[PDB]
Amino acid sequence: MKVEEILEKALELVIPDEEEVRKGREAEEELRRRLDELGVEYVFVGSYARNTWLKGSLEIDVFLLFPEEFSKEELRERGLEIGKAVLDSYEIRYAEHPYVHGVVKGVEVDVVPCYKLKEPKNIKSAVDRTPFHHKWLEGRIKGKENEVRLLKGFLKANGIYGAEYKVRGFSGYLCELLIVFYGSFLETVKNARRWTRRTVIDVAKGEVRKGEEFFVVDPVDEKRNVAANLSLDNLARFVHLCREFMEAPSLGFFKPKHPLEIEPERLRKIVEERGTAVFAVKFRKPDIVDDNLYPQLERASRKIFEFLERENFMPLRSAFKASEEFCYLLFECQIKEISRVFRRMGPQFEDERNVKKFLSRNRAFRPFIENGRWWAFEMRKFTTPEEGVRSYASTHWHTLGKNVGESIREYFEIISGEKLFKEPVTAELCEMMGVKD
Amino acid sequence: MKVEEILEKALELVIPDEEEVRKGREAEEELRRRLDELGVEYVFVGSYARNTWLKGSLEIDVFLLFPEEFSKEELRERGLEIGKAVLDSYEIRYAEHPYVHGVVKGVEVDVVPCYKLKEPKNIKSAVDRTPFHHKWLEGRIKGKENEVRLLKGFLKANGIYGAEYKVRGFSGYLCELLIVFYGSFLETVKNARRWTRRTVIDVAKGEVRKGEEFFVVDPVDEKRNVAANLSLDNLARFVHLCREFMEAPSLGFFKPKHPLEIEPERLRKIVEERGTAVFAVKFRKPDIVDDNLYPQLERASRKIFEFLERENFMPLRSAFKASEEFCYLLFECQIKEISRVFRRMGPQFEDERNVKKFLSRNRAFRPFIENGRWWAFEMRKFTTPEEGVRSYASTHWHTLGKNVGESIREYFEIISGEKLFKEPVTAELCEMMGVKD
Ligand SMILES: O=c1ccn([C@@H]2O[C@H](COP(=O)(O)OP(=O)(O)OP(=O)(O)O)[C@@H](O)[C@H]2O)c(=O)[nH]1
Ligand SMILES: O=c1ccn([C@@H]2O[C@H](COP(=O)(O)OP(=O)(O)OP(=O)(O)O)[C@@H](O)[C@H]2O)c(=O)[nH]1
Ligand SMILES: O=c1ccn([C@@H]2O[C@H](COP(=O)(O)OP(=O)(O)OP(=O)(O)O)[C@@H](O)[C@H]2O)c(=O)[nH]1
Ligand SMILES: O=c1ccn([C@@H]2O[C@H](COP(=O)(O)OP(=O)(O)OP(=O)(O)O)[C@@H](O)[C@H]2O)c(=O)[nH]1
Ligand SMILES: [Mn+2]
Ligand SMILES: [Mn+2]
Ligand SMILES: [Mn+2]
Ligand SMILES: [Mn+2]
Numbered sequence A, B: 001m002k003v004e005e006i007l008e009k010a011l012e013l014v015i016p017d018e019e020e021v022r023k024g025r026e027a028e029e030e031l032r033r034r035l036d037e038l039g040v041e042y043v044f045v046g047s048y049a050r051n052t053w054l055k056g057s058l059e060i061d062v063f064l065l066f067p068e069e070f071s072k073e074e075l076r077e078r079g080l081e082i083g084k085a086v087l088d089s090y091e092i093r094y095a096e097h098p099y100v101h102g103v104v105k106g107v108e109v110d111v112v113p114c115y116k117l118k119e120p121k122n123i124k125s126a127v128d129r130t131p132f133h134h135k136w137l138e139g140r141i142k143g144k145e146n147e148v149r150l151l152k153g154f155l156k157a158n159g160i161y162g163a164e165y166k167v168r169g170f171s172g173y174l175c176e177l178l179i180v181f182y183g184s185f186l187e188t189v190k191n192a193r194r195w196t197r198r199t200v201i202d203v204a205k206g207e208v209r210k211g212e213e214f215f216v217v218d219p220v221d222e223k224r225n226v227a228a229n230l231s232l233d234n235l236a237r238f239v240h241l242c243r244e245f246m247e248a249p250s251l252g253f254f255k256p257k258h259p260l261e262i263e264p265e266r267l268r269k270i271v272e273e274r275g276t277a278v279f280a281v282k283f284r285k286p287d288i289v290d291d292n293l294y295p296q297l298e299r300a301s302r303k304i305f306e307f308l309e310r311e312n313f314m315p316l317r318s319a320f321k322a323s324e325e326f327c328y329l330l331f332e333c334q335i336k337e338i339s340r341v342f343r344r345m346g347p348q349f350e351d352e353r354n355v356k357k358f359l360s361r362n363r364a365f366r367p368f369i370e371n372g373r374w375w376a377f378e379m380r381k382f383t384t385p386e387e388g389v390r391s392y393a394s395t396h397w398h399t400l401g402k403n404v405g406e407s408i409r410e411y412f413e414i415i416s417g418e419k420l421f422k423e424p425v426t427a428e429l430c431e432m433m434g435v436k437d
């Protein structure tokens, strides 16, 4: 319905509602009140400050600004003190150096202590450059706030907003840098059609060039890749969505797909048509934060995938899910049953001592020579992919992530069939198998 | 029972019997009679001449010796004429240049025409060096005739005597050169324990050295490998048999193993225990000689093996058999059934034009991105190895050898199970699966 009219309608799905904007301003004024009474110098940074936050993601970022001559724990101990006095409730979170996360009048706030540096040139981590992030964007982004919200809404409706590990998508700072570089949502989307996995966007030089990896150069620190947490596959999904949108634009690109919600009977039918083995490893969810859990689920699922490939079960795809109580690692394989017998490699015929050792073992069938080398028929200890994973998980839990592995050691189950379709995984199965509406 | 006493007992299994020696001498005298009346110059060569032929392999080789100045077809036309006058019956065989094979008083004779060269130095093929083979061996092998017969009997009882393609073993000329080089059967067997696939035996230089392939240098022609038709796997089998014999010598090494002769019920049991797919391609045997047929059966069986590997049926081993009326190509696979669905590779995400073409095809399930590249779920046209070979044999017969392929084009069958155990292939199946006594 013409690109320009679709973008006007999308603004209603992307701009926060009335009670959100008011809820936020009440919390900000109260927060100013408490900090001012303590005599601390501070600055509100982030998407709240710059009026670029997406509908439904209200969150207030504050940095406490201190004299340049204070030690490492003079900023840690003192900075925390103020953060605990100013919030209704709090939690010691850990991004790189510890900060405070809490609530003020029912609104999430982060309080981060750092130096008051005149000019940046002083490297440490991402914490100490964040004030300079705000300083660089403030007033380069003025007038373009809705362009930022269009880009964030687009990305969110398609599951790729956020740099946290559950997502591996686009951060808020990244969205704002893109809008500054290209000028608008529409120009971002038109130009991203030509991005590659080697594209380097150098915001401070107004330059695009080729490199070894996808790299967005932080204008505050030339060694920092702002797109570091963006996965290759999510970059690919975004380039394809940009091409599709420009080919046939729709308001539907700004709305989240309502899920498949299939009945166990239709899934049973689909699994019968495909002729595959479909199963899950179930275990208790360890008590750790998402940014620690999700890298472990990814690793555990890859190590089991690699086992299935090496054992000739021909895995197609894998997925994983965490609920409140349990985690699930999901697999589909092309092979449901393999023969008991397999071929084990022995030595070359010339090597007399090692040939004697190879032929000494008792076996049911006779070894043989093929292309100058000895081989023997031997028996597998499992013949289905479910039996294989039971064995792998019981013995090699120590490679499946520190905490995920320790949980599997205590308890796991392999589930298939009518039992599997009753766990909260039908949505992940459907996506993994490419099931249509 | 002591190596030396075993070798004395083996001489009875290796030396021709009474009526064989007499049957041969009658045919030789008659043959001399007929050639002498024609005024042709000739010489008896080969294992008959030198009294080195194994029990049960009586055959007389004659070469007709002609003046040096006769053209290529002056030796072909004239040489044939004499060969047809001298034999009771005949056949035009083809080794390299045509010769005559027939019978005299119930004994096989070959008559080959070639030049009467003073000194060898005149290269053409293996035909024109054969008189010089005899000349070089005559009287180097005197006194060692039973040593040669021990070596041939050893090799025969173990299925590796003969350079013809059905066997790919040791020729008679090769056995005689080995006995000259090492001095005896026992010294041959002790030294062959250390042969490798790089061993070069240079009989004329009294030297063993290393090369690129196993090579026995003809003392008449330094460019000719006398062991050219010996397979790598039969060289390996011979080195291992030599090691075993010296470790625990037995008369049993000179006797042929009496076969397994299993009942269909025991084979059914074994196939059930292994859990594999076992099947054969059956077709009519083309009307051609063995040295043409066996290379074609080997090729056809390899091309089908390579198909099964490429289609993920995990073939273990293959074999082949020709009876009087039919041929059989035999296979055992680890996978009895594979899923209908498989993963087809598409283009990298960057390549917009080729991505559009890939996503245009109608399919039952949705394509997906993985590690920067597009993939699609598609459906196989067969799910068992038997169904796969039916398809391969029907469409790609043109790669299965000229004559074997043309027969399969006219008629073939895939046979498994209780039907398979009733064809004359149980012995080849047992060997292929390493079945024990
Ligand atoms: O791990 C890190 C490191 C550094 N920072 C830095 O802290 C600042 C605030 O981090 P946010 O991710 O909250 O940025 P935001 O407010 O712009 O976006 P949304 O909440 O709307 O998603 C950003 O400017 C970033 O540079 C992180 O956010 N996370
Ligand atoms: O490339 C490979 C990898 C692994 N393997 C075999 O599979 C097993 C598991 O290999 P994994 O890599 O899945 O588990 P792990 O890290 O716990 O390995 P280990 O420390 O226990 O060795 C190993 O014990 C190895 O022998 C291979 O044979 N080849
Ligand atoms: O293809 C060829 C080429 C050449 N020759 C040459 O012709 C001669 C006779 O060929 P034979 O193989 O009949 O030799 P043989 O008589 O020594 O052994 P057996 O029959 O007892 O097995 C051999 O000396 C060889 O060099 C072939 O036999 N075949
Ligand atoms: O390495 C290979 C070989 C073969 N193939 C595929 O399998 C088929 C049969 O490959 P074959 O090599 O078994 O038969 P052929 O000689 O008759 O091959 P064509 O002349 O018909 O091509 C071919 O059509 C080829 O596409 C591969 O995909 N990869
Ligand atoms: Mn924020
Ligand atoms: Mn924040
Ligand atoms: Mn927070
Ligand atoms: Mn930075």
Ligand SMILES: [Mn+2]
Pocket: A395, A396, A397, A398, A399
């Ligand atoms: Mn392990």
Ligand SMILES: [Mn+2]
Pocket: B046, B047, B048, B059, B060, B061
């Ligand atoms: Mn002969």
Ligand SMILES: [Mn+2]
Pocket: B046, B059, B060, B061, B110
């Ligand atoms: Mn002959």
Ligand SMILES: [Mn+2]
Pocket: B059, B101, B102, B108, B109, B110
């Ligand atoms: Mn003959």
Ligand SMILES: [Mn+2]
Pocket: B126, B129, B130, B133, B218, B220, B221, B224
């Ligand atoms: Mn020669």
Ligand SMILES: [Mn+2]
Pocket: B395, B396, B397, B398, B399
């Ligand atoms: Mn073909």
Ligand code: NA
Pocket: A390, A391, A392, A394, A395
């Ligand atoms: Na195990």
Ligand code: NA
Pocket: B390, B391, B392, B394, B395
């Ligand atoms: Na076909």
